[PDB]
């Protein structure tokens, strides 16, 4: 859907750590009235957990990331990011990112250990 | 999860028309950083829609719905509505609520016909 969003990112680490997802437009996105990443655990819905509000710049987290992830973008490199910190095996899930107008990133696995 | 969601309204509308979708909360829910409406067309991927933002009580909506739609919640009542105007066929969808903490609503669906 007119921008395109290549995802990169994840992986697997230890409960208590951190990773960061990236996801890389194929052009400006910041006129995107919302920007952000969402959540898909195996036998549930996907879920919004962070986004940055298209003009004003403010940012809003669901309760269960709130203080541990926080969502950056760059307008220069036109990359959003989550950076996840104090990583539980609760967070364990597929991420994606989407923007307003915007096509979906693929899918990445986060995997947090015991 | 903790607070139970009861989804009601939708239907079938003529384009340009109007249809309201309530949300009746079993327990205040004002507290959630993420009080939203996602939408879920066919072959696609649940997207959010709208969202009050728990605390400054502002607002969000995805480019293709904002002007048209309006998200409120009554405290009172412990109700979220999303008042959906000047519909098109492309707003055909099953339509969801969710707030931070709480359980999903069931979704409703709303068919916009020519």
């Known amino acids: 859907a007119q921008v395109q969003l290549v995802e990169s990112g994840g992986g697997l680490v230890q409960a208590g750590g951190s990773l960061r997802l990236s996801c890389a437009a194929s052009?400006?996105?910041?006129?995107?009235?919302?920007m952000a990443w969402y959540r898909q655990a195996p036998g549930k819905a996907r879920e919004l957990i962070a986004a940055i509000r298209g003009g004003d710049m403010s940012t809003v987290y669901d309760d269960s990331v709130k203080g541990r992830f926080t969502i950056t973008r760059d307008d220069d490199k036109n990359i959003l990011y989550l950076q996840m910190n104090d990583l539980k095996p609760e967070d364990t899930a597929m991420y994606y990112c989407?923007?307003?107008?915007?096509?979906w990133g693929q899918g990445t696995q986060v995997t947090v250990s015991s | 999860a903790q607070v139970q969601l009861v989804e009601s309204g939708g239907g079938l509308v003529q384009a340009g028309g109007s249809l309201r979708l309530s949300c009746?909360?079993?327990?205040?829910?004002?507290?959630?950083?993420?009080?939203?409406?996602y939408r879920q067309a066919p072959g696609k991927a649940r997207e959010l829609i709208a969202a009050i933002r728990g605390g400054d009580m502002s607002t969000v909506y995805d480019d293709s719905v904002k002007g048209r739609f309006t998200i409120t919640r009554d405290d009172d009542k412990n109700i979220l509505y999303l008042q959906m105007n000047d519909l098109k066929p492309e707003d055909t969808a099953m339509?969801?609520?969710?707030?931070?903490?709480?359980?999903?609503?069931?979704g409703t669906q709303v068919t916009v016909s020519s």
């Open positions: 989407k923007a307003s107008g915007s096509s």
């Open positions: 052009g400006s996105f910041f006129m995107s009235n919302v």
